[PDB]
Design an enzyme around this catalytic site. Structure first.
Site, PDB file in Angstrom:
ATOM      1  N   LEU F 120      34.915  44.463  37.719  1.00 42.27           N
ATOM      2  CA  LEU F 120      35.032  43.665  36.540  1.00 42.27           C
ATOM      3  C   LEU F 120      34.062  42.499  36.769  1.00 42.27           C
ATOM      4  O   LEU F 120      34.001  41.958  37.913  1.00 42.27           O
ATOM      5  CB  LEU F 120      36.472  43.106  36.332  1.00 42.27           C
ATOM      6  N   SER F 121      33.360  42.033  35.657  1.00 42.77           N
ATOM      7  CA  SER F 121      32.532  40.811  35.685  1.00 42.77           C
ATOM      8  C   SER F 121      33.087  39.956  34.628  1.00 42.77           C
ATOM      9  O   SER F 121      33.216  40.440  33.497  1.00 42.77           O
ATOM     10  CB  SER F 121      31.042  41.204  35.348  1.00 42.77           C
ATOM     11  N   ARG F 122      33.519  38.674  34.917  1.00 39.16           N
ATOM     12  CA  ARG F 122      34.210  37.835  33.998  1.00 39.16           C
ATOM     13  C   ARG F 122      33.328  37.145  32.999  1.00 39.16           C
ATOM     14  O   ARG F 122      33.682  36.948  31.869  1.00 39.16           O
ATOM     15  CB  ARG F 122      35.079  36.779  34.655  1.00 39.16           C
ATOM     16  N   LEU F 123      32.129  36.765  33.443  1.00 41.20           N
ATOM     17  CA  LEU F 123      31.195  36.020  32.653  1.00 41.20           C
ATOM     18  C   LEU F 123      30.273  36.905  31.736  1.00 41.20           C
ATOM     19  O   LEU F 123      29.120  36.571  31.432  1.00 41.20           O
ATOM     20  CB  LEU F 123      30.218  35.174  33.518  1.00 41.20           C
ATOM     21  N   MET F 124      30.838  38.107  31.438  1.00 39.50           N
ATOM     22  CA  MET F 124      30.054  39.123  30.829  1.00 39.50           C
ATOM     23  C   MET F 124      29.620  38.788  29.451  1.00 39.50           C
ATOM     24  O   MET F 124      28.459  38.922  29.118  1.00 39.50           O
ATOM     25  CB  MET F 124      30.858  40.431  30.711  1.00 39.50           C
TER      26      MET F 124
END
Lengths: 51, 457, 593, 45, 593, 129, 160
Positions: F120-124
């Site tokens: 998962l990448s949060r700042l996507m």
């Protein structure tokens, strides 16, 4: 209905055996073995700091 | 000099620097009692001793030290059988005295001469499950893995007593031509145990057969570690000088390992995995290295160590280490014991990787090894099927599985079930084993070579 | 003598301590608190002080007692409540207005107010006398054997002064012994360090049982004196009951009760209950308490007393073994003695082994088991006495896979499995035939066969019948009981009577929980004769319903067997069983035909 | 074989799952066997 | 020179050391025991003495040799048995009358007794030479010269004197080198410190077949020439067994066996067995041994010998590679080597990492593997060689997460498994596909395709079959064989057959016979063929029973095929395997309609 | 990384630096400090392991005035095959998401064998163009 | 503060923030202290513990950890403003917490749950299916409920 009950009971007798014999000792062995290794890492550290 | 201090089994001596490593010293108590110890660590103008005997009562300037000026060696004689000794280098039982013709070191290399040629002679226990499935040789090391609900002493004695009757039947067959000697050493077990063992040896034969080293649990941990070393010196002399096969029964091996554990707890030595020493590997090795054929190649030391597992786990450090080192594994099962099987030896994980060295062929069949592998394989399938019988029922299991469930039941109750004095020859065992194989058809016995199956069925 | 260098916690180090032994009893400060030297580094001795080292400045004096910490063995043990290092709790109640012993209060191990009547032996002045020989005796009991006074072990010589008959105090000298000038004086007690085992003529294996008086113990797997045994814990909702009942029903000559480090509810219950209850053999003068000597520690008492607790008790047991008596050491619990070791280790800085419990644990247990056992008692005409250890081992991790339990079971040859569900419903004791074992079975069964019972036949058969019943019960659940033979139904019918009468006994009634070893054998006889006959009769043409109506009266008697009295003419042959046998044979001709 | 860190969280809930599930399967079997006895008798009639 | 200050355990501290290199070899005391300088604290150097010490006095002499623990590389390494501290074991037997090392023996590194026949190179007088060049050669074997005499690395010059053809001894001079006058004389042996790897020209890609001769490796995950391998397993794993097979069959021109701390009987067996048995490319007198050199060490034999084993052996291997030979080095076990370190960290008092093994473990294993690989030999002639390392390790109770196994797995690119369950039924070694991978598998199949077999196509289907088998087996267990489909039944049978016929190397008459990549391929054609035709058949309507009974004979034949010696028509395709292919075809057709 | 800072800032390069293998870096940290005053943290891995890591992450990121960037893709090998172990655990807190591989796909034969459930990448949403 | 800055600074960061929140509380302003994440702050104490050469007894985290985590948190709350003019100020600390021992029964998480009154959950597995915050009812509790719900009843919601 009676023929239908006979077919279901067999699936049901299989499950009652399955849980006891397989699952329950697989959970036991995994939990205890990991518990024992995990506490070991922690204990030796204390001994090394102390030494 | 005089005792400086004492911290547990370690004794701090303030002394002078002339002592050598493991040089005996004797501690003179104010009672005028002398107890022996050996220096474990030496430094300038001071020593750390571990005292064999005792661990308390040790003073300061009222106490004195005296040097023996001989590092510890065991007085070994070959007239040791029948004679009662105590695990301390002398009898404190008032038994017949040891005498010396050599004094031999317990460091693990006195003059040590061992196997450049592996065991090839079969030695039988009179017990089918031992002999057929794993085999025992003139140097073989086999651990008895036992439990806290099994009676470890009854099986220990069982294997030893029945292997004494079989062993002269094997001498006549020309498997042997030299003497048999037993060296029994009990280290730090209960009084109840000690008494029992002596009673067992007498019934079967005599106590002239065996030599006894007795060490009591009330005596320290430091004593316990020296106790097998004393057994090793006894056995190496007999093999070397007088070309005798020596059989050592070492009980309890676990007793010895806990002792090691105590001298790292009350030492500043950091322990390894599960609180058992880091240098635990070396301590255990010392016992196991001093095994095999002894020079002249008519002498030998063969080992059966007896391990009692406390948790009954195969993740405990003692059973694991022992197993890599030893030439075989014999696993004794609580569930068989319960059911009414005596001996109650489960062969499901009993394995030898040095299976060839273990079997014989010049005083045992060549077919012995071939049948054993097939038996083991067919037992294992019969266990996979047993779990499946509980789950699935007989409502889907196959024609082939049914043969394997029958084999399992016939196998426990006939092969592993033997009288308390009933001894089976290795040849007779084959006949029994062939009865077990005989119910399976020629397409289920497909893994085995065609030659053997058509020959013997 | 020494001067205090440091007080860091309850650990106090002192300098200027020479000729200080490594078990040396020392008294610290002006207050005279009890302490003992665990270690020595140089000139400095490292002391664990068991009492609060509050108010103790550095520079207070340390006075050696001049000898290790010892326990006193002699007259006036029985009917006294003690500490883990033997200090009368009762005597503090008189003086202090305290139950417990508070800091700066020590007293002697035996009371000196009490005087006992010393009677000389068969040796007179000028006789040589040897270690353990009976020099005299004291009689102060009539219900049990009393305190026979021995010449101190490892001590020999010619007796200069043998005090004649009369009352002397425990403190006062009654012997002087000539061995290289005056050897010393000795008194009515002897001191012995408790971390040293007491000698005996020789030790033997056990072979000799005695009245346990709880039916389930004898019947399921026999109870032996000179045994090693594990009993599960429960923390006073199950533990307490079995302990109280074992003390009361067993008519062993002495019982030594040790509470290692208990709740304090259990300690409170055992002291009040012992004079209150009645002997099972007759006699008053505080019945059970007169046979009992108690070491009672709650967890609140000092940690060295908790560690010491079993050692002092075991020395006590060993002392009575040389008199020739059979002793039950009932110790509760080793897990709590073990907890002390763990605490004492961290205070020293010792590095332990697994689960925080030291490595001194496994060797200290092995040493402990061997002190207990059967032996031919020391003293010139020789007797036999025994010391039987039943030690509870409770949860110490919430499981029984922890180091204390797993270590003990191994040395132990006997396990008796208390059942929780039955215990919560208050059937005590209720031992499970599945988990339990005795490796003593063989030698013992041969011993009772000698004596008069048919015991080997009946005990073995008892076990098989019950094991078999679990396996047949499963066939009833899944297939049905109706398709199964009469024979199988019978196997279960009999198992239920064996379960009801023996296993479900209620230690809140004495016509349901006290019966002699012969009586217990006679009941079991009764059930076995019926099983064989019932299977024999259904084969010759009978049915379960038919069988049940026909047996009638004998079946009712066997059901009612436990309610019957310990005697009927004798307490060894119960006439009602012997005649029951006839009524069964006569019934079997009628029923079958 | 398996993680040496925080197998305890997933394994703990499995273990409970299993014994809880077993108890429950037994009640469902007991009900199924309960009805089964009854219908066998009714069907012959 | 130096004087022993202290001996605390195997650790010795000696004053009056002004110098000493790292891991400098010393002879300690009048006894002359092995040691190495690990550390220096002040003037006092802490030296671990690794040969058993039960009698070394303080102020005994300490002699520096002046260089680190080193190995001789020179003539007579082949068919000559040595320890890990390079003492010839044979020399010891004769002199000492101690077949193993006794405490206090000092026997020189090589045999200076066996004269060797030297012939001169392509380098004559006035010619430049440089390290790793073939200065000459020594006849050692009946078929080949083993030991190519190299100028050592870190030496150079022009040769003033070349000895002529003839016999000389090892210590006599045979070479004189010019560079700043007489740089020195050279002798037949040259020395090198074993903590320095030998330098190569270049390392070269690993993509060339390594035939180990065992069916089970060839089938599933073959190794490469240049390979690195990890193998776990714990007793009954067949590791000794696979070493013996490995030595016999191995296409490499040298095999170097490393015993890290072995049973002794295991070493005694392999030593006897190489001259008893015959080689596959022929071998005249001690056939297999001619290619085999042993480094053997037992479980209590010196901790230095055991620790140095992997470095003594890897140095040997690099020297053979610089000579132009393909080397297969088997070390067994690195885990026993790891115990030598666990012990070293405690004694010294350095702090270790997890499981009481130090943190430096990870670097030391990695250094050993990186010196392995396939390379172009250092020296002017230029050759191609490899060192392919097969390194055995052991799990701690079924735990594969123990530091040693994880570390080795970190460095390896090939992993081959070992399953306990499967060994119990006798299938050791037991390699599946969920405990094993090989990065070389992809390139390796491309190279085998070329040589003749169809292997890559069969390899993919083979992998799939095993992978599905495991999953399908879990359903049989829990649900039963009533939830299966017919094609899934097929996957179960073919799988059981694979388990037995490759993985098992256990006898039934005779331990199984040399099976090549060609043989291994035929087995795979017959199993894969069985599976395709059978599934078609069931899909297209047909009985399971009809199909399995019919394959019958064909199944017995593949099982036993490996016992029969290779070539039975050809090595390539046997007539015995060729004929089955027809039988399947005939069956498929009968079944369909 | 110092070399990457030179190119990114002075001559305005987009730098992609691949730093393999972080497990070897981590191991090194443990072996040192067995003879200094500083003394390792949790399981013999330094408590100041985090400080070390952070020195590598320091020279990464966008650059002032928008002359170039250094982008960094480190390669970590999980040695015990759990992410509850120190090497994944400390590193993961610093890092802006993670992409964790898949053991199961590999066996099947897949390449690249990663899985998306633990990734998962949060700042996507905010980052992208 | 980023991780890359000095650990001395990262240790101080939280203090600077609470003193600013507290000054403002005393001004009679209502303040939100939003802190993310305390476990990184705890990791900072741990970096210093190994460097100074202290003795940790909480899985490699300092023994001091429990007193510092607690002391800091007690500074938030609603309060009557410091001074004579009389005003009302508040500091609400909304703090993220995270694993640090890798467990959930590691010291960091043990100390924080004890000192807090409000916990609203979050699960990682459900969060991946995209439903964050994916609150666990069982780990969640609030002590504030009764007084806060009484307040909300007055404000108009039938909420409780």
């Amino acid at each position: 209905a009676f023929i239908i009950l006979d077919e279901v009971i067999k699936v049901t007798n299989r499950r009652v055996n399955a849980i006891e014999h397989v699952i329950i000792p697989r959970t036991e062995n995994t939990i205890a073995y990991i518990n024992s290794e995990l506490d070991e890492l922690d204990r030796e550290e204390f001994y090394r700091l102390k030494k | 000099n005089t005792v400086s201090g004492v911290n547990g089994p370690l004794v701090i001596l303030e002394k002078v620097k002339f002592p050598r490593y493991n040089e005996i010293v004797n501690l003179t108590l104010p009672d005028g009692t002398v107890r022996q110890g050996q220096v474990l660590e030496i430094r300038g103008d001071r020593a750390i001793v571990q005292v064999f005997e005792g661990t308390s009562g040790i003073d300061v300037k009222k106490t004195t030290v005296e040097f023996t000026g001989e590092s510890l060696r065991i007085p070994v004689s070959e007239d040791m059988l029948g004679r009662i000794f105590d695990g301390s280098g002398r009898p404190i039982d008032n038994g017949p005295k040891v005498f010396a013709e050599d004094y031999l070191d317990i460091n693990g290399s006195p003059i040590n001469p061992y196997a450049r040629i592996y065991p090839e002679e079969m030695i039988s226990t009179g017990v089918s499950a031992i002999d057929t499935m794993n085999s025992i040789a003139r140097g073989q090391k086999i651990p008895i893995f036992s439990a806290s609900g099994l009676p470890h002493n009854e099986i220990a004695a069982q294997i030893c007593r029945q292997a004494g009757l079989v062993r002269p039947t094997k001498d006549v067959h020309d498997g042997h031509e030299e003497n048999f000697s037993i060296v029994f050493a009990a280290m730090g077990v209960n009084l109840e145990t000690a008494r029992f063992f002596k009673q067992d040896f007498e019934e079967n034969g005599s106590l002239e057969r065996t030599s006894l080293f007795l060490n009591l649990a009330n005596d320290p941990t430091i004593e316990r570690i020296i106790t097998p070393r004393l057994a090793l010196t006894t056995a190496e002399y007999l093999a070397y000088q007088t070309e005798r096969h020596v059989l050592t029964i070492l009980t309890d091996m676990s007793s010895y390992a806990d002792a090691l554990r105590e001298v790292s707890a009350a030492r500043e030595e950091v322990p390894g995995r599960r609180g058992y020493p880091g240098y635990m590997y070396t301590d255990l090795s010392t016992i196991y290295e001093r095994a095999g054929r002894v020079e002249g190649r008519n002498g030998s030391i063969t080992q059966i160590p007896i391990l009692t597992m406390p948790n009954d786990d195969i993740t405990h450090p003692i059973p694991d280490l022992t197993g890599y080192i030893t030439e075989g594994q014999i696993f004794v099962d609580r569930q068989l014991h319960n059911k009414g099987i005596y001996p109650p030896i489960n062969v499901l994980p009993s394995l030898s990787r040095l299976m060839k060295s273990a079997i014989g062929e010049g005083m045992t069949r060549k077919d012995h090894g071939d049948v054993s592998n097939q038996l083991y394989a067919k037992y294992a399938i019969g266990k996979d099927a047993a779990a499946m019988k509980a789950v699935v029922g007989e409502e889907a299991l196959s024609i082939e599985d049914k043969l394997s469930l029958e084999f399992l039941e016939k196998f426990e109750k006939t092969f592993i079930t033997q009288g308390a004095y009933e001894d089976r020859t290795v040849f007779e065992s084959l006949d029994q084993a062939w009865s077990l194989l005989r119910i399976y058809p020629k397409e289920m016995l497909n893994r085995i070579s065609p030659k053997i199956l058509d020959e013997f069925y | 003598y020494g001067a205090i260098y440091s007080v860091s916690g309850p650990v106090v180090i002192a300098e200027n301590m020479i000729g200080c032994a490594m078990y040396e009893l020392v008294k610290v400060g002006h207050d005279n608190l009890v302490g003992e030297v665990i270690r020595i580094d140089g000139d400095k001795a490292t002391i664990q002080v068991y009492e609060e080292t509050a108010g103790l400045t550095v520079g207070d004096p340390v006075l050696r007692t001049g000898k290790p910490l010892s326990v006193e063995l002699g007259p006036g043990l029985m009917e006294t409540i003690y500490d883990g290092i033997q200090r009368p709790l009762k005597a503090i109640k008189e003086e202090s207005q305290s139950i417990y012993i508070p800091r700066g209060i020590d007293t002697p191990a035996l009371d000196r107010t009490i005087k006992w009547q010393f009677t000389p032996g068969k040796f007179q002045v000028g006789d040589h006398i040897s270690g353990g020989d009976i020099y005299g005796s004291v009689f102060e009991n009539s219900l049990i054997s009393s305190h026979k006074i021995l010449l101190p072990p490892r001590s020999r010589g010619t007796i200069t002064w043998i005090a004649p008959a009369g009352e002397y105090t425990l403190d006062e000298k009654i012997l002087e012994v000539e061995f290289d000038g005056k050897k010393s004086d000795f008194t009515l007690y002897h001191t012995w360090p408790v971390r040293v085992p007491r000698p005996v003529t020789e030790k033997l294996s056990a072979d000799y049982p005695l009245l346990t008086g709880q039916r389930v113990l004898d019947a399921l797997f026999p109870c032996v004196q000179g045994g090693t045994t594990c009993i599960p814990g429960a923390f006073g909702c199950g533990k307490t009951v079995i302990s109280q009942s074992l003390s009361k029903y067993s008519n062993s000559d002495a019982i030594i009760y040790v509470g290692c480090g208990e709740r304090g509810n259990e300690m409170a219950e055992v002291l009040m209950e012992f004079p209150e209850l009645y002997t099972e053999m007759s006699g008053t003068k505080e019945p059970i308490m007169k046979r009992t000597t108690l070491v009672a520690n709650t967890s609140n008492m000092p940690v060295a007393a908790r560690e010491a607790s079993i050692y002092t008790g075991i020395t006590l047991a060993e002392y009575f073994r040389d008199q020739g008596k059979n002793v039950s050491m009932i110790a509760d619990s080793s897990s709590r003695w073990a907890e002390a070791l763990r605490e004492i280790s961290g205070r020293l800085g010792e590095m332990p082994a697994d689960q925080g419990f030291p490595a001194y644990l496994g060797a200290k247990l092995a040493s402990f088991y061997e002190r207990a056992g059967k032996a031919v008692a020391l003293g010139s005409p020789d007797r036999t006495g025994s010391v039987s250890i039943v030690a509870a081992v409770s949860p110490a991790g919430g499981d029984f896979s922890d180091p204390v339990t797993t270590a003990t079971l191994g040395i132990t040859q006997v396990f008796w499995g208390l059942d929780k569900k039955l215990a919560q419903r208050k059937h005590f004791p209720s031992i499970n035939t599945s988990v339990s074992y005795s490796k003593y079975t063989n030698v013992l069964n041969k011993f009772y066969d000698s004596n008069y019972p048919e015991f080997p036949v009946l005990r073995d058969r008892m076990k098989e019948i019950l094991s078999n019943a679990e396996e047949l019960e499963q066939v009833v659940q899944l297939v049905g009981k109706s398709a199964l033979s009469d024979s199988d139904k019978i196997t279960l019918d009999v198992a239920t009577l064996i379960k009801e009468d023996f296993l479900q006994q209620n230690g809140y009634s004495t016509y349901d929980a006290f019966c002699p070893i012969w009586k217990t054998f006679d009941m079991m006889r009764a059930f076995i004769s019926y099983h064989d006959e019932a299977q024999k009769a259904v084969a010759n043409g009978a049915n379960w319903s038919k069988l049940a109506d026909s047996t009638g009266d004998v079946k009712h008697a066997v059901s009612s067997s436990k309610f019957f009295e310990p005697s009927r003419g004798e307490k060894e042959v119960h006439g009602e069983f012997e005649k029951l046998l006839s009524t069964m044979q006569e019934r079997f001709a009628e029923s079958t035909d | 074989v398996f993680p040496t860190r925080m197998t305890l969280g997933l394994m703990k809930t499995k273990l409970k799952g299993a014994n809880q599930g077993y108890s429950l399967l037994k009640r469902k079997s007991e009900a199924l066997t309960k009805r089964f006895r009854d219908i066998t008798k009714r069907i012959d009639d």
